[PDB]
Structure 1
Amino acid sequence: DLGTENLYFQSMGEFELIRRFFAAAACAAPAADVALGIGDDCALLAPPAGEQLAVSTDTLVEGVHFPAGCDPFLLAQRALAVSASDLAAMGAAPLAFTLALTLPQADAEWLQGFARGLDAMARQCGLALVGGDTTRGPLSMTLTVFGRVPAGQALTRAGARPGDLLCVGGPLGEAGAALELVLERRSAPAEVAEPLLARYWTPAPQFGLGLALRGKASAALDISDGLLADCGHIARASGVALLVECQRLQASAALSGLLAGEEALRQQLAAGDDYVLVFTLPPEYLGEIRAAWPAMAVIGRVEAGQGVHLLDADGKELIPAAAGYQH
């Protein structure tokens, strides 16, 4: 060979170098049920026979689902956790995900921090990064998550039945409170700020609860938009009434650390971004689910009828004063 006549500078440019932050990420390593990870036109998933693949996609847009200029290490954890919460909402076991990242141009420090946070949440969630896309534009990420669940055992939003208990998998309103700190509308000491901020940036997807509920919950989903709003999805898909007992909404120590009374209750009822499951449960399974997931709480019940109903201590229904208002 003479050392000449080689073709270069046709490809493998800036966005290839960006892509390599993810090809080299710890969460891109080989993993169970992944026959082919990053590097080809598709990833290949191989859930053990009899198991279906649960698939969900979520998009986070800069300025909409997270603040501009935020720590990329926290942002990557938040993006993966909120997306992975939908697998828990089905009772699926975590398997893998793809990352479609759009960004204006390379930023090496941003990407290093983003990839490091993605590794941490992925390890926490047991999710392999198996593919993705890297594109130029205003900052955005679309994560598509994959889990496995035996046929017929997925948790669905229909099936809530009158007589069932209405339950949640953990404290509500904490991410809404945390947003007050994130936006610096309020201050707090570390003992208050740290637990709440962890709920905004690193909500733990409730995989264990979803798995515990297989064959037991009559219906479930994860609270992303707000307690009362997401109860409406069960009520409508199941054709029943969901009753929420306002007295059973215990504000957490962390929530009470920053907010009190009505402000706290409003966060519980309507903040969303909780990524805690809401589920309906035949009463015969209460003890088991309490043992499997002690953070769970009964907040109400299911009856024949329509709609979501917030009840005060005397059983009377609470209605916002005007259309569009909240409690």
Structure 2
Amino acid sequence: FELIRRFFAAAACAAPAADVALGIGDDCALLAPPAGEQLAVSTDTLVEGVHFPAGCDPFLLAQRALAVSASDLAAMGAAPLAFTLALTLPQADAEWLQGFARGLDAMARQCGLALVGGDTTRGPLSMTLTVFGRVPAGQALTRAGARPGDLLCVGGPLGEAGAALELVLERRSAPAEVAEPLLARYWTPAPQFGLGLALRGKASAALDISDGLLADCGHIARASGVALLVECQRLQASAALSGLLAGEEALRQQLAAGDDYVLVFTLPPEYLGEIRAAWPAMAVIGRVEAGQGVHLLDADGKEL
């Protein structure tokens, strides 16, 4: 118990914060959600050996856990507010917990997220973070509004965290300056809060890419009752990705690595200029048509 007060109640991100009436210390936290906005709520579990490697640095792990969880707020166009941390520990290592809380502080500061509570238990290493944000009624980015003619877009480079995973698992090697930007996408992805806000009233549908580009395109296609067409030639590897992989290897990571935590969204053509101006890292990758399913097209428009 005492390590909770020492490491988390005392953490910088657990300090008093706006819209938080009561933080760590009681049976519940108390939020005063801003009047006139809805509260966006999402929860994510990271499991040792599944979402991160055993033996990893806890300073990095805490940032990854909070970032991948906070990304679902950006996927709704919500502004960040607070979170809770449920932590399951095989043993209560003070030095591990110290590094974990240090990394949690760093990512929470960068995300504007107040730590208001949590839970600590014993067992195989796992953590579940529940994040809270605010969005005006009727302005949240949902998945069901895509229409034929909409552009299919992403908020940034794809495949970088999958390339990074090869390095993390020591299944591939790279020069240090190639590894560093890719490892940053795995351990410290940046939730695309600013893009989510910019897409309010403009994107017809949106979510974040967690499972993988093609898989997660499926949610828009199914919820909206349309076909999504991904154009292979529009999947250009970033400089960072290209430092490690080429051709088909890079393409496969873009299509199916997941862990990107960039938004995939459909956009009426009339808003392309506004979103390009507000978020130059966005890219058009395809289009929406009438029909069903997700379709990958080659340079000639033939299905793969």
TM-score (norm 1): 0.92
What is the DSSP-based 3-state SS (H/G/I as helix, E as strand, rest coil) of the residue aligned with 2:237?
Answer: coil
1:116 aligns with 2:102: yes
Give the deviation of 1:65 after TM superposition: 0.6
Question: Which residue of the other structure, out of 153, 160, 174, is the alignment partner of 1:167?
Answer: 153
Q: What residue in structure 1 maps to residue 15 of structure 2?
A: 29
Give the deviation of 1:290 after TM superposition: 0.5
Identity %: 100
Give the deviation of 1:162 after TM superposition: 0.3
Contact in 2 for aligned 1:243/1:309 (Cα 8 Å): yes
Contact in 1 for aligned 2:20/2:31 (Cα 8 Å): yes
Contact in 1 for aligned 2:227/2:293 (Cα 8 Å): yes
Contact in 1 for aligned 2:74/2:195 (Cα 8 Å): yes
Q: What residue in structure 1 maps to residue 225 of structure 2?
A: 239
| Superposed CA offset, 1:229-265 (max 9, x none) | 0000000000000000000001011111011000000
What is the DSSP-based 3-state SS (H/G/I as helix, E as strand, rest coil) of the residue aligned with 1:258?
Answer: coil
Quote the RMSD (CA, aligned, Å). Answer: 0.7
Q: Which moved more, 1:239-248 or 1:35-44?
A: 35-44
Separation in 1 of the partners of 2:58 and 2:91? 15
Separation in 2 of the partners of 1:19 and 1:174? 37
Separation in 2 of the partners of 1:19 and 1:235? 46
Give the deviation of 1:295 after TM superposition: 0.3
Contact in 2 for aligned 1:219/1:279 (Cα 8 Å): yes
Separation in 1 of the partners of 2:12 and 2:3? 17
| Superposed CA offset, 1:144-180 (max 9, x none) | 0000000110000110100000000000000000011
Give the aligned length. Answer: 304
| Superposed CA offset, 1:28-52 (max 9, x none) | 0111111111111111112221101
What is the DSSP-based 3-state SS (H/G/I as helix, E as strand, rest coil) of the residue aligned with 2:4?
Answer: helix
Which entry has the higher C-alpha Rg, 1 or 2? 1
Q: Which moved more, 1:16-25 or 1:198-207?
A: 16-25
1:228 aligns with 2:228: no
Contact in 1 for aligned 2:3/2:94 (Cα 8 Å): no
Separation in 2 of the partners of 1:32 and 1:290? 32
Structure 2 gaps of 5+ residues are: none
Separation in 1 of the partners of 2:167 and 2:4? 32
Contact in 2 for aligned 1:19/1:134 (Cα 8 Å): no
Separation in 1 of the partners of 2:130 and 2:100? 17
| Superposed CA offset, 1:66-92 (max 9, x none) | 000000000000000000000000000
Separation in 2 of the partners of 1:276 and 1:288? 18
Give the deviation of 1:104 after TM superposition: 1.5
Structure 1 gaps of 5+ residues are: 1-14, 319-327
Separation in 2 of the partners of 1:132 and 1:17? 13
Give the deviation of 1:207 after TM superposition: 0.2
Separation in 2 of the partners of 1:17 and 1:130? 16
Contact in 2 for aligned 1:88/1:205 (Cα 8 Å): yes
Contact in 2 for aligned 1:18/1:106 (Cα 8 Å): no
Contact in 1 for aligned 2:45/2:126 (Cα 8 Å): yes
What is the DSSP-based 3-state SS (H/G/I as helix, E as strand, rest coil) of the residue aligned with 2:299?
Answer: coil
Separation in 1 of the partners of 2:47 and 2:189? 18
Separation in 1 of the partners of 2:134 and 2:6? 28
Contact in 2 for aligned 1:245/1:299 (Cα 8 Å): yes
Separation in 1 of the partners of 2:224 and 2:281? 25
Give the deviation of 1:19 after TM superposition: 4.8
Give the deviation of 1:212 after TM superposition: 0.3
Contact in 2 for aligned 1:88/1:207 (Cα 8 Å): yes
Separation in 2 of the partners of 1:255 and 1:280? 24
What is the DSSP-based 3-state SS (H/G/I as helix, E as strand, rest coil) of the residue aligned with 2:87?
Answer: strand
Separation in 1 of the partners of 2:303 and 2:265? 21
Give the deviation of 1:18 after TM superposition: 3.9
1:153 aligns with 2:177: no
Separation in 2 of the partners of 1:193 and 1:112? 26
Separation in 2 of the partners of 1:48 and 1:79? 26
Q: What residue in structure 2 maps to residue 135 of structure 1?
A: 121
Matches within 5 A, 1:178-327: 178-318=164-304
| Superposed CA offset, 1:269-324 (max 9, x none) | 00000000000000100001001110000000001100000000000000xxxxxx
TM-score (norm 2): 0.99
Separation in 1 of the partners of 2:231 and 2:194? 26
What is the DSSP-based 3-state SS (H/G/I as helix, E as strand, rest coil) of the residue aligned with 1:177?
Answer: helix
Separation in 2 of the partners of 1:48 and 1:68? 40
Give the deviation of 1:16 after TM superposition: 3.2
Q: What residue in structure 2 maps to residue 84 of structure 1?
A: 70
